[PDB]
């Protein structure tokens, strides 16, 4: 018996087309170009799911160091004071949120100087 | 499928799976060899495992 592949091809092609939306030119009409765009976007997102956390960590370091320089103490000295003695388990991101609430990070500053 | 007669003539089977053969240089022009070679090549012989696999599917 001759067997056709009608529904399965259409359903898979429509699903793959639906998987991407918001492309430029004829990158959302053809199945082939849509698959290419999905592959590239997925690989880029795979690398991003690590590069974003790297960049966010760098940004947190930058924004902590900004206030640290404003107070007059270098970032390395502050981390040494946190590590060498006065043991504290404080994420480098949490300290940033303490800067948006005044008198908290200032309290940490007045504490670490002991 | 058709067992080659050229292979059926020079290979006789043996129980448990094996073949027997006569060595070369035995019954031909070889006066330039020692008597040790002559009486060593007289005895029957067998093939290697690789050649056994090669011949087994052909027979």
């Amino acid at each position: 018996m001759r067997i056709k592949g009608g529904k399965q091809t259409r359903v898979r092609r429509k699903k793959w087309l639906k998987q991407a939306s918001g492309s430029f030119g004829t990158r959302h009409a053809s199945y082939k170009v849509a698959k290419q765009t999905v592959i590239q976007a997925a690989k880029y997102a795979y690398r991003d799911r690590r590069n974003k956390k790297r960049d966010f960590r760098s940004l947190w370091i930058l924004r902590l160091n900004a206030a640290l320089r404003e107070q007059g103490m270098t970032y390395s000295v502050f981390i040494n004071l946190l590590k060498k003695h006065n043991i504290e388990i404080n994420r480098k991101v949490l300290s940033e949120l303490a800067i948006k609430e005044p008198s908290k990070f200032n309290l940490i500053v007045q504490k670490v100087k002991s | 499928m058709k067992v080659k007669s050229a292979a059926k003539k020079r290979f006789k089977l043996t129980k448990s799976g094996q073949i027997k053969r006569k060595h070369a240089y035995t019954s031909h022009l070889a006066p330039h060899k020692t008597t040790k070679q002559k009486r060593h090549l007289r005895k029957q012989g067998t093939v290697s495992a690789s050649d056994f696999k090669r011949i087994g599917n052909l027979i």
Binding site: - | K4, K22, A24, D51
Partner: protein, 148 residues
Amino acid sequence: LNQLKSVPKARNHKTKTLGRGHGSGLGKTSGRGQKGQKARKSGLTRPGFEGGQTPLYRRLPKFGNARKGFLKQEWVVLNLNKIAKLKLDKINRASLIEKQVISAKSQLPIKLIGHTKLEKPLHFEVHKVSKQALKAVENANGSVKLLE
């Protein structure tokens, strides 16, 4: 059972379909590699064809046949080992056509053979015997008649 749940005891193997799967399942052209005669159509070189060197069957001498046009004047052998375990006595052709041991539409010569002491008295009728078989059958007071 009924014809809605019939399933055997886990006997359904897997096949190698070489037409689907670019990187999934099996290879795109499995058992063939790439850039080769074994991969091209009408390949599968001859089993005895090693290609370059002289074939093994041509490098060795041949065993002749001292009986041109003959295999042997075949006669049926009768081992003393297995017959003892079989419940029979006074063995002739008609005895051996009973338990489907010899042909019932043709006749061939019979030769007794083997060496094993008997515990039940039996008498044999064959054309050829053996010395060890002779002493084995004489131990159990058996008899055999030389039949032409």
